[PDB]
Amino acid sequence: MNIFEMLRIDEGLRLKIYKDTEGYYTIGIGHLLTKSPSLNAAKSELDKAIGRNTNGVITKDEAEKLFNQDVDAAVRGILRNAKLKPVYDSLDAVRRAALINMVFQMGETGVAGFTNSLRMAQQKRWDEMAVNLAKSRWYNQTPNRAKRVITTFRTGTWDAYK
Ligand SMILES: [Cl-]
Ligand SMILES: [Cl-]
C-alpha cells in the first residue's frame, strides 16, 4: 500500500463533475473545483485545470494527472508549514501517509488547527492522539474515512485499508 492507493480508496474516481460530501463541486479523485454554488463556475475551473474545453467530463488519464499534482501539492504544503513540518519529520512512513491524507481532504490550514493532536503525535502518544482526533467535526461528518485515517495514524500499519 502507499499514499496514492490509500487516497484512491478514500476518494474514489469519478469522471464527471459531482458534489462531494460538503456539497462542493469536485471531479476525478477528490479534486475540489470550487466552493461556489455555480455549476458554470465549476465548469470554468475544470477547463482551466485541464487546459481544454471539457463539457464537464474528463478522461481517466486527466483524472490521474490532477491526482498526482494534488498529492504533490499536499506534501509540499506540509513541508512549507511551520506547524506541520516538524510533525511530519518526526513520523515513520505509514504515519506520514495519514497526515498527507488529512491535508489532502481538509487543507493545510485545517490540519494545522489540530494543535493538540499534533503535539501528541510529536510525543508519540498514539492512543491519546487518536481519541483527540475523534473529537472533531471531521470525525462526526465523515466517520468511516476518519476511522480509517485515525487507525493508520495510531498504529502505523495499513490494516484499516486491507
Ligand atoms: Cl489545478
Ligand atoms: Cl465516511
Curated annotation (Swiss-Prot):
GO MF, one term, reads:
lysozyme activity
In short, the EC number is: 3.2.1.17
Q: What is the organism field in this record?
A: Enterobacteria phage T4 (Bacteriophage T4)
Descriptive protein name: Endolysin
**Gene Ontology CC, one term:** host cell cytoplasm
Q: What does this protein do?
A: Endolysin with lysozyme activity that degrades host peptidoglycans and participates with the holin and spanin proteins in the sequential events which lead to the programmed host cell lysis releasing the mature viral particles. Once the holin has permeabilized the host cell membrane, the endolysin can reach the periplasm and break down the peptidoglycan layer.
Query: What CDD domains does the entry give?
Result: T4-like_lys
Give yes or no: UniProt keyword Membrane.
Answer: no
Tell me what effect the entry lists for residue 11 to A/F/H/M/N: Complete loss of enzymatic activity
Where is it located?
Host cytoplasm
InterPro entries in UniProt: Endolysin_T4_type (IPR034690), Glyco_hydro_24 (IPR002196), Lysozyme-like_dom_sf (IPR023346), Lysozyme_dom_sf (IPR023347), Phage_lysozyme-like (IPR052619), T4-type_lysozyme (IPR001165)
Q: Which Gene3D superfamilies match?
A: 1.10.530.40
Primary localization? host cell
| GO terms for biological process, alphabetical | cell wall macromolecule catabolic process; defense response to bacterium; peptidoglycan catabolic process; viral release from host cell by cytolysis
- What reaction(s) does this enzyme catalyze? Hydrolysis of (1->4)-beta-linkages between N-acetylmuramic acid and N-acetyl-D-glucosamine residues in a peptidoglycan and between N-acetyl-D-glucosamine residues in chitodextrins
Member of which family? Belongs to the glycosyl hydrolase 24 family.
List the active-site residues.
11, 20
Q: Which SUPFAM superfamilies match?
A: Lysozyme-like (SSF53955)
**pH profile of the protein:** Optimum pH is 7.3.
Q: Please provide the record's keywords in A-Z order.
A: Antimicrobial, Bacteriolytic enzyme, Cytolysis, Glycosidase, Host cell lysis by virus, Host cytoplasm, Hydrolase, Viral release from host cell
* Conditions for induction: Expressed late in the viral replication.
Locate the residues binding substrate. 32, 104, 117, 132
Task: Specify whether Hydrolase is a keyword of the entry.
Answer: yes
